[PDB]
């Protein structure tokens, strides 16, 4: 479904592309998926046998690259599906990459520290032939953290005899992980608001801004544009909106929260702080906040997307229409996966950089996506959701035809 | 004979550098050499077999490096004198490479798109055991391109179970090539004017300079000298040449420049390339073609800088009477290094697995050029030698000095 | 020969053309897979280094890897060496080995060098072609001047490498490093057995057949025992100076005119030695054993052959007879694979299998085809290769 | 204690003696004996092991690969307290010396742990073999190097590491180790090996005296799995075996002990002794009238202030070990019969080398297969160095030391390393 | 007893880091340590058996890291203290390494070039299973040099069939050295007084430094902090010391003194080294000489800060009393840290195939170094320790997370 929902996007995006039909032949299924059965000690001095998966969409770019889940709902089609939405990142940020993507069944909350630790050593055993720094290179997903990766790139460290750091990012720093981590993804948001605030004339410094959600990543990019010389007009929590056209006190508003509009008065529902005046729009959260009844209401000129699916492909189609600047969700937040690339560089060299050559780096690497993007969806005539699958599945296509496979 | 001539510039070059011998004996033949027989299926259903070669020149230094020629002249002698000419290459730019070529006997203008993939693949699946990213790195020459090598990139990296980029250069930006590619060879040749000059006192916006052909290298130093500030009188193609003691218009030629590099052939009076080359001027590039600057020639020259672009287009002789004079000759086997520097550069990409800019790649490339142009005029002044030499001597130098701190002479 | 190897491709072209395969096949066989040359620098006794051209031929891998042994001599070329690669894919189809051909040598002078200067080109021809050799790929041996001490450096060497002893890697070693038992009779054995095969095929028996034997040195010596033991009479023996001829038997035991009428005199036998066209087209009329076997090289001229087949005389080739060397090679490495050494019974017993399996299945191909058995063994020879080459997929 | 360690040592130091002798009486000039005094290579190792109560306690280990001039290296690891680098040195080139003795392509390797497992559970125990092949893993496998059983290791610990090593290498990988259950491709006569070696032995020396093995008198000294089985296999024989012994004292009795009954009635431990009353001690066993005395036990059992005293004409070696320079001059003096150690339990390497045989091959063979090329190892090894004590003249353990060493030594040279 | 007195350093640092008892018995010895007999083909025809060793610590954090000794003291227990040593060092310049160090029992000395090869080879192979780029690199240490290390990398690149530059470090440039080495430790201390002057609020043109010793580390030295506009008040050679408290001409010192680093002797007013040691001012750079302060002249230094440059200066004893009189003791294991700095650079640049100028070099370096005296700066302020415990403690901490991270203890 979700697996269906993705293929028919890929099958859209070579369409436009110019691709015929065997090019989605090859992109519609993974190159590789295997399934494996992981029997662990468990505590209690059962056996249990867990099912596992790895699916590696395809490495015409390069090795495959993306997150292992540890949930009670993981299953085949949908470690699939999540494979192939890690190409289209790794083509939207131009990653020398393919997507792929793991998961096991199965409910960490119920397990101790020590079923977890063989569970991952487990899980690495039973895939080692498949995986490694040239060929598939996971990284932390849902239930899954730098600890699970520490034990994960131990037990390959051992199978190999010799430390293989590259096999796996999301590492602790002492195991050989990046600086620059933690606001990777916030950061390539606020790149993206720079960007395309210069394609519609205004200055930072006068852009008046809403920001719904104000937890991490609203606090941070609400601080951002603060510090930039901007107005954040608006802001948002579970419980509401605050409003004020001369822009919100954000260093008293950061100072106590959790989240916030709660000690407020006049607060407004954040259907309505959607339709307000302002520049850019940034929701959070949510799926399908901005629809086909709110779209025609929306004053910004600019949408970012912070998450998850806030607008639908309806109310997109409209914005476009209307002129709005739609920057989504897989652009604006492709800073995670890019310094987990990062990480990956870093590895290969053996050397770390600064937290402030972390960032000089994502920033470059944000400003060239987003221009491919826009510059895709000019000469295209489509929306910039359109023109990022476009762009994330081009360049394990132009890789495929270049060698010989389609 | 290349092979031959080759030989004699390793044996002087060394004989220069005060090695005894032994030293020649390693250097004069590959340290590996190999010849393969490739079958291949034909579009017409009947089955070819092709014979392939690689030759490994010295690896003392670093793994081999060099291109891969498809032509029916190709032989082993023409293969194994290149490679030692890749050393020289490694060595001018200092490169952490010796040098490597390969080559099969066949006609690709007579074979379709398939049965060149097919040959391509044959090839990598024959030479596979002693080729890869830590051994020996091919590239494109004749008649080979980047969807050949991207062809050859796939081969390897199914051999091995994972991809490999960096067994082979010249690919396309998509499977690991670098930006900077395409004019990296024209880049490397400014800059060695522009360290000519500031080695003859002259200013880069004064120097008055002509160029011999009009083809794509010719137009682009064209282009850059003009913008820069300098008149660029003199300028030839297959026709002749025109001149003015001041700057000719270059926009002008550039727009209405024909595809294949044609101009004066429109245009009022036109003297013919010899006698555009005996013309006054601080600069003279004869881009095109060979033996343009003979004994005959050489007193006539009145340029203080001879900057060569393609290959051979001065004798032995010319370039002694050139020494003779004063005149900074730039041998081409350095000033036009910024071809083997650049497919270094995506081979180190692919090790990083980090790819860079391209005006990272042209900042990189310039101070390569810039300390290769010093490190060759230093040894000229230092042994009281020409340039020409003195880059012969740069270039086989680490090598030997390699094969020496290794032990094996 | 002076052109040999002008001279092996005509052979595996006629061969190939009688097997029936097209050209295409002849394309690929005509020239090796791979040939290596290398240089080797070489520290020399006296403080000097001097660097050595090396060579490793491997003609055609499909059926296995490559087998055969390196020479060290002043005359060693990249011609002759692929000459001797096809020649050993030969043998291995003779004999049904799992290999194709391989060959190497060095050019140099081993009599004018120390112990320790061989040692050092040995490990230098090994560090020069390790990518391409080893126990599963291309399995050398001895050859002109070089002898087990030899094949024992150069094991050493490659173990080293890898970090594990590949005793698989060289054959010809020492007992005591993972060589073989039964290697010393192995050529000769061999000789005795296709005595005994053809013998049973002119409806003869071993003990009344009557045997002339040209040579009387280590070679000769060895067969007119054996012919002795098994009850036959040895009617005829020979050396430089004359030969003794016995219609009774020659007093073989004790025994521890001119050739040109001896190899005429009646008899069933006639067994040759080392020097080449004892047996030409003046000859080739007048001989009148039923059963000629060449122990050593080239005694019969090409005509010499074609009068003989011509009218009935069954002539075992020295290509045939002499296998029993190239199939203990094989068993050394037969051993080193299992790490399980046979006895010299166990050995002499499967180089006899060998050896008669052989024999018929050339036989029955000069009968199939009505050519003799030289033509039949180069073409068994050849055709396990071109087999296994169009399986592949290769032609 | 110092005593045991002492000990450890002085086993090191006799056999670098005896070896120098054998190398000097085989025509070697010094420097073979300064390549064989001491292994190529010597590993020790720190493995962290999470215990059952929750800490983490860190073990020593050590792999000693004395010579590989002829093949890999072989030989059992063991898990005891008193394990120490030495001792694991001494062991490995006792096994160079089996291996030598028996014709196997083979140099020696030992290893151990320092730790006690009577102490310790299973989970432990597989947690600590397995930390032992992800330590050494790097210079250990079927080309390499191939561990084995010892003291307080089983097919069980065997198993763990194979499985182990599997891991690391992505395929199985059964002759890294010898040793294994059957259905892992262990090979059949494993179980029995070194008794069944130790007896074809004791067949030969008895036709050497003109004994009939159905007349011997026999007193074993250690009641072990050694022992036990060859109290059996004697019993069997229709041998009287008058002695019996395990740690706490030893049963003689000159009609003929009832061997069915004891064995029937030992201890896993392998102790008996303590239902009967009349226990001597082992001391006194050992100068009690024999034909055949087998010490089975420990070590330095036979000594100077002793062995006048013993009254067999033949001692068969079964442990490492048991009798002294000193002792084995005296015995070789008074015309006994010795069958040294490293002859003696030739069969367990022989039987391991089977194993490895057909885990190369991927091919294994029936009981009566292996039991048939056990025979003829054995016998073939017994008259070889009774024939060399002969040529030679010199007592049976420098005769075992010199056909033990004799192949290393010349693959060694040949190979060109001295 | 270096193997006791540095277990004991263990215990201690991790003690103080909060750590349990068995981190410590996980730290005690190395994981690995391997010891191989060599046999060697003298140049008299004997053939010799040599004992080497190699000892890898822990690696935890990445591959161990360190020199291999030719020495005829070395023994089992001095090389594995000295890989311990490493630890700290790699954990301190916070390198992703973590310790290994080898040796020969062999005296270079009495041995022939030719010799000297063959050990170094026969070592190579002797222990190349545990050995590698990503495993435990390699390094000069006391009688080995550049020359071993090139032999040692050809063997180890012969055994693997493809060249292998960052199997060991210390390399001849031409095999893939790297620049910046030859002052990267003389740098390091240098960049060590900048830090503990701000710390202490003294601009660096304001501080009066004594400096013992005028080789190429004192020197240096003197220049530097000349040039800086501080004032060299005290400097001093094998025959005494020269005092002035408006500070020396070093200029003029630089020029007289000889290629052994002797002045003083051109000089009538010379004090003794001893003496020098107790003249007041803000900074003391004592000489590589063990025990120059104990505890009978520790209370007698006026210097507010000492930097050691090498060897152990200053007693344990001598090294409390100055912590408890607030001098800033600067320990020699911090301030000399740029060897190993350059060293793991050499490896980064191997791993790229890319290799940096002189002046990347100097300005990674001075970062590195720049972050540990501030690291070890503010871990022994939180624990109220001096600089040297805090030294040991920031150097196993690195080793002692990763060890926990993976599980091990």
Same mark, same amino acid.
């Given at each position: 479904?979700?697996?269906?929902?993705? /293929?028919?996007?890929?099958?859209?995006?070579?369409?436009?592309?110019?691709?015929?039909?065997?090019?989605?032949?090859?992109?519609?299924?993974?190159?590789?998926?295997?399934?494996?059965?992981?029997?662990?000690?468990?505590?209690? @001095?059962?056996?249990? #046998?867990?099912? @596992?998966?790895?699916?590696?969409?395809?490495?015409?770019?390069?090795?495959?690259?993306?997150?292992?889940?540890?949930?009670?709902?993981?299953?085949?089609?949908?470690?699939? %599906?999540?494979?192939?939405?890690?190409?289209?990142?790794? @083509?939207?940020?131009?990653?020398?990459?393919?997507?792929?993507?793991?998961?096991?069944?199965?409910?960490?909350?119920?397990?101790?520290?020590?079923?977890?630790?063989?569970?991952?050593?487990?899980?690495?055993?039973?895939?080692?032939?498949?995986?490694?720094?040239? $060929?598939?290179?996971?990284?932390?997903?849902?239930?899954?953290?730098?600890?699970?990766?520490?034990?994960?790139?131990?037990?390959?460290?051992?199978?190999?005899?010799?430390?293989?750091?590259?096999?796996? *990012? @999301?590492?602790?720093?002492?195991? +050989?992980?990046?600086?620059?981590?933690?606001?990777?993804?916030?950061?390539?948001?606020?790149?993206?608001?720079?960007? %395309?605030?210069?394609?519609?004339?205004?200055?930072?410094?006068?852009?008046?801004?809403?920001? /719904?959600?104000?937890?991490?990543?609203?606090?941070?990019? %609400?601080?951002?544009?603060?510090?930039?010389?901007? $107005?954040?007009?608006?802001?948002?929590?579970?419980?509401?909106?605050?409003?004020?056209?001369? +822009?919100?006190?954000?260093?008293?508003?950061?100072?106590?929260?959790?989240? #916030?509009?709660?000690?407020?008065?006049?607060?407004?529902?954040?259907?309505?702080?959607?339709?307000?005046?302002?520049?850019?729009?940034?929701?959070?959260?949510?799926?399908? /906040?901005?629809?086909?009844?709110?779209?025609?209401?929306?004053?910004?000129?600019?949408?970012?997307?912070?998450?998850?699916?806030?607008? *639908?492909?309806?109310?997109?189609?409209?914005?476009?229409?209307?002129?709005?600047?739609?920057?989504?969700?897989?652009?604006?937040?492709?800073?995670?996966?890019?310094?987990?690339?990062?990480?990956?560089?870093?590895?290969?060299?053996?050397?770390?950089?600064?937290?402030?050559?972390?960032?000089?780096?994502?920033?470059?690497?944000?400003?060239?996506?987003?221009?491919?993007?826009? /510059?895709?969806? %000019? *000469?295209?005539?489509?929306?910039?959701?359109?023109?990022?699958?476009? *762009?994330?599945?081009?360049?394990?296509?132009?890789?495929?035809?270049?060698?010989?496979?389609?």
């Amino acid at each position: 479904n979700l697996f269906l929902s993705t /293929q028919t996007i890929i099958k859209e995006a070579l369409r436009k592309l110019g691709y015929p039909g065997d090019m989605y032949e090859l992109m519609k299924e993974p190159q590789r998926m295997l399934t494996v059965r992981i029997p662990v000690k468990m505590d209690n @001095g059962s056996v249990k #046998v867990f099912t @596992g998966y790895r699916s590696q969409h395809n490495d015409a770019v390069g090795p495959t690259k993306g997150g292992v889940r540890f949930h009670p709902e993981v299953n085949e089609e949908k470690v699939k %599906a999540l494979s192939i939405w890690m190409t289209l990142k790794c @083509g939207i940020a131009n990653l020398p990459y393919g997507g792929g993507k793991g998961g096991i069944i199965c409910d960490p909350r119920t397990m101790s520290f020590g079923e977890l630790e063989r569970l991952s050593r487990g899980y690495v055993r039973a895939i080692s032939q498949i995986v490694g720094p040239t $060929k598939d290179i996971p990284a932390p997903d849902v239930y899954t953290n730098s600890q699970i990766m520490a034990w994960m790139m131990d037990e390959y460290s051992r199978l190999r005899e010799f430390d293989s750091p590259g096999f796996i *990012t @999301g590492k602790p720093l002492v195991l +050989g992980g990046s600086q620059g981590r933690e606001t990777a993804t916030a950061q390539g948001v606020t790149i993206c608001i720079e960007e %395309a605030v210069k394609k519609k004339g205004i200055k930072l410094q006068n852009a008046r801004i809403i920001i /719904q959600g104000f937890g991490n990543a609203g606090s941070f990019l %609400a601080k951002f544009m603060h510090d930039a010389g901007a $107005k954040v007009i608006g802001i948002s929590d579970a419980n509401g909106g605050l409003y004020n056209p001369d +822009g919100l006190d954000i260093p008293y508003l950061l100072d106590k929260r959790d989240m #916030v509009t709660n000690l407020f008065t006049d607060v407004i529902t954040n259907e309505e702080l959607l339709e307000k005046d302002c520049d850019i729009l940034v929701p959070a959260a949510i799926s399908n /906040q901005i629809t086909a009844k709110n779209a025609h209401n929306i004053q910004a000129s600019i949408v970012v997307e912070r998450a998850n699916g806030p607008t *639908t492909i309806d109310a997109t189609k409209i914005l476009n229409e209307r002129g709005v600047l739609l920057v989504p969700d897989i652009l604006a937040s492709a800073g995670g996966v890019t310094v987990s690339y990062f990480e990956w560089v870093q590895n290969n060299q053996g050397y770390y950089w600064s937290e402030e050559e972390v960032a000089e780096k994502l920033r470059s690497v944000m400003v060239s996506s987003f221009e491919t993007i826009y /510059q895709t969806a %000019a *000469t295209h005539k489509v929306d910039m959701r359109l023109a990022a699958y476009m *762009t994330g599945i081009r360049k394990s296509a132009e890789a495929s035809r270049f060698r010989g496979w389609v």
